[PDB]
Amino acid sequence: RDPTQFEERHLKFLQQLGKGNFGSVEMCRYDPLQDNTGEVVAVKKLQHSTEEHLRDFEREIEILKSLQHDNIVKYKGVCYSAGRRNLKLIMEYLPYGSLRDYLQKHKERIDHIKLLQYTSQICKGMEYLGTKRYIHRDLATRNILVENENRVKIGDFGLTKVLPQDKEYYKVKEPGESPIFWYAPESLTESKFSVASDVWSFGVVLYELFTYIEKSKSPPAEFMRMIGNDKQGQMIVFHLIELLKNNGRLPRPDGCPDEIYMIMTECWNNNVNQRPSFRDLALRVDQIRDNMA
Ligand SMILES: NC(=O)c1cc(-c2ccnc(N)n2)[nH]c1-c1cc(C(F)(F)F)ccc1Cl
């Protein structure tokens, strides 16, 4: 028998781990001996497994399966249902949960050197993703998972796109989910996504880390304050595009080291070509960690 083939009927629900707009993740024990001794795994499934969604989810699964990196969650296998061929994605269970939750919980008990360890690890997962010509589109602490206090991994690829062979961006024609407060200006105006727009989002992740996920300071709270809390629906996108074009940016987080804030603002360059590379970010971050240690 083949360990990447999981039989649905042996997957026992233990608890719900997260829910997003089209999918959820559950903690399950894969327990074919039925004695509660089987492996605990994380299971992603669709809430509305329509034909169109299933096609996208099967691509997402092939994307994950193709990635093998210390800072990318490990694919374990898939569950197939009889008939309509519903799919479940089986992944390693990372027991400290999302980095967003983890940091919200421990706050400044996690110090700067540890935040920079996480930053370096995120940078390296992304740099590796870019070698495969994948654009994540949703890089945010809510999509990063914590294996243990010394290792984080990019943990979800639901918005991930594969670049066409002849172009350095992917244009999304009819967006669903759009985490606009993490989006580069060209992603807001033209729905164009690229390694450089993931770099813009990584700058937002760095902001998240350094604000310790304080709610009143989250990217949506701060951008809504800068455009005015009265803006709603499609007008938020309009005013956010105008704000970014005028160099309105998230503020320096309280207590943030200068050199870290410098990296965020360089990621938030309006000129796509001036944003740094993930290769360079990982070098720079590791130099900072070295200097600090
Ligand atoms: N939202 C969460 O808090 C959470 C927790 C996990 C998790 C926990 C432990 N191991 C693994 N693989 N995933 N994975 C998620 C998660 C869920 C979703 C969604 F939207 F699909 F449900 C998306 C992204 C993440 Cl990280």
Side-chain angles (χ1 to χ4, degrees), residues 1-83 85-293:
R1 271 211 256 84
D2 177 348
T4 73
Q5 295 305 313
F6 289 77
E7 168 50 69
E8 206 148 345
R9 77 194 203 171
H10 289 138
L11 270 178
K12 182 195 192 277
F13 177 86
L14 297 183
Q15 70 153 335
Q16 205 201 231
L17 296 168
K19 221 150 173 171
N21 291 0
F22 346 105
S24 60
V25 180
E26 305 178 331
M27 183 187 192
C28 290
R29 189 185 300 278
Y30 184 65
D31 198 37
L33 289 359
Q34 276 189 87
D35 59 359
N36 300 317
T37 70
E39 185 178 13
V40 166
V41 290
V43 181
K44 185 167 173 179
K45 59 188 191 188
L46 292 190
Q47 268 102 82
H48 300 77
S49 36
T50 65
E51 49 284 345
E52 169 193 285
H53 294 318
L54 279 169
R55 280 191 224 94
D56 284 340
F57 190 44
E58 191 162 11
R59 302 182 45 189
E60 171 181 344
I61 287 168
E62 289 296 322
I63 278 161
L64 182 69
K65 181 160 42 168
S66 74
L67 298 167
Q68 301 148 246
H69 184 282
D70 292 346
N71 309 295
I72 290 189
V73 62
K74 290 172 166 166
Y75 169 88
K76 283 180 139 291
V78 289
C79 189
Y80 295 88
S81 86
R85 202 189 180 254
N86 197 22
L87 306 159
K88 295 181 191 182
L89 161 62
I90 314 299
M91 294 170 258
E92 62 174 348
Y93 178 68
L94 294 189
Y96 295 27
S98 76
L99 176 62
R100 181 215 262 279
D101 286 355
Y102 186 77
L103 198 51
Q104 204 158 26
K105 188 197 289 352
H106 308 308
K107 293 283 187 189
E108 25 269 285
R109 303 346 108 194
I110 292 165
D111 56 21
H112 291 182
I113 87 226
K114 178 66 61 186
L115 293 175
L116 291 178
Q117 196 180 17
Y118 297 158
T119 296
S120 171
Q121 285 171 358
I122 296 164
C123 202
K124 291 171 180 166
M126 291 297 304
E127 193 263 352
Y128 170 79
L129 231 215
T131 71
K132 311 290 200 188
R133 309 191 34 93
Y134 298 159
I135 312 308
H136 185 96
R137 314 178 41 243
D138 200 13
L139 178 60
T141 64
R142 66 177 161 93
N143 290 317
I144 296 158
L145 294 170
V146 187
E147 176 164 18
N148 60 51
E149 83 175 0
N150 290 301
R151 194 204 252 175
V152 303
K153 304 195 192 192
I154 306 160
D156 188 80
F157 297 85
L159 296 193
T160 299
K161 295 297 184 190
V162 188
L163 287 178
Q165 117 167 348
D166 50 324
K167 307 195 87 95
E168 299 312 310
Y169 65 86
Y170 187 102
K171 179 161 322 137
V172 171
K173 296 188 310 190
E174 287 188 0
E177 190 159 1
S178 298
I180 56 168
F181 296 115
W182 278 250
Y183 269 12
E186 68 278 6
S187 302
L188 303 167
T189 59
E190 299 186 82
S191 292
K192 289 176 50 168
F193 300 86
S194 62
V195 173
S197 65
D198 277 350
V199 168
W200 175 285
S201 309
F202 167 78
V204 190
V205 165
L206 190 50
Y207 175 86
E208 299 183 80
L209 296 173
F210 282 87
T211 57
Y212 288 98
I213 323 301
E214 202 191 316
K215 201 221 82 143
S216 74
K217 300 298 192 279
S218 67
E222 293 284 280
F223 277 122
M224 279 306 306
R225 172 179 70 69
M226 289 185 272
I227 67 175
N229 294 303
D230 61 304
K231 304 309 181 305
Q232 298 185 117
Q234 63 181 113
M235 296 309 291
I236 295 173
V237 175
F238 170 84
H239 288 285
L240 178 62
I241 286 168
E242 290 308 306
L243 177 73
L244 292 174
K245 287 178 164 173
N246 281 289
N247 281 301
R249 295 293 187 271
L250 297 169
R252 172 183 194 121
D254 218 306
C256 186
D258 294 314
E259 51 288 10
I260 298 304
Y261 180 59
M262 301 174 22
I263 288 176
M264 307 174 195
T265 60
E266 183 173 357
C267 294
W268 303 328
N269 208 105
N270 287 335
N271 183 336
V272 166
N273 285 330
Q274 300 179 333
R275 294 180 199 151
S277 69
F278 286 114
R279 179 180 289 152
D280 287 347
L281 288 169
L283 279 163
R284 293 161 64 179
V285 179
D286 283 356
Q287 185 61 60
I288 296 163
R289 297 167 66 200
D290 199 57
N291 294 345
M292 272 173 196

